[PDB]
Amino acid sequence: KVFGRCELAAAMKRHGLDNYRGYSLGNWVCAAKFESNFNTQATNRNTDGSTDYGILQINSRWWCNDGRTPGSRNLCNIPCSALLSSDITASVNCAKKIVSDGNGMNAWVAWRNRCKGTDVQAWIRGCRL
Ligand SMILES: [Cl-]
Ligand SMILES: [Cl-]
């Protein structure tokens, strides 16, 4: 599923991400834009052999199981395929664990490089929330 911008903001808010660990909703929408262009089926292979999955491009090195990432962990206790669903619940629940791991949203390199220090509120401007 490819979400619309306000549609995803509303879904993220419904699942408790607005101001989760202090990160306003626009931070999460911005991150999803640049990680996946709002596409739940996005996948991308990393040079270390791990793969990133879903609207927030969650990595199999640490967070999900895909059966082909040697030596990895599955700390969200989910198959990576669950992160590709049109229902964002699994992605949101795993994102809450990631953002609580110590480094906040800097866990997403694209958030640090393209959202951090910008007007992230623009990503929810105009949306009915
Ligand atoms: Cl915001
Ligand atoms: Cl980047």
CA of 9 to the centre of ligand 1 (A): 10
Residue 65 · residue 79 · CB < 8 Å: yes
The distance of Cα 108 from the centroid of its chain, to the nearest Å, equals: 8
When divided into structural domains, the chain yields a total of: 1
Structural domain contains residue 18: yes
Name the experiment that determined this structure.
X-ray
Which H or E run contains 33? Answer: helix 25-36
Residue 21 CB partners (closer than 8 Å, separation 6+): 96, 99, 100, 104
Structural domain contains residue 25: yes
PDB resolution in Å: 1.6
CA of 20 to the centre of ligand 2 (A): 22
CATH number at residue 91: 1.10.530.10
Structural domain contains residue 129: no
Ligand nearest to the CA of 110: 2
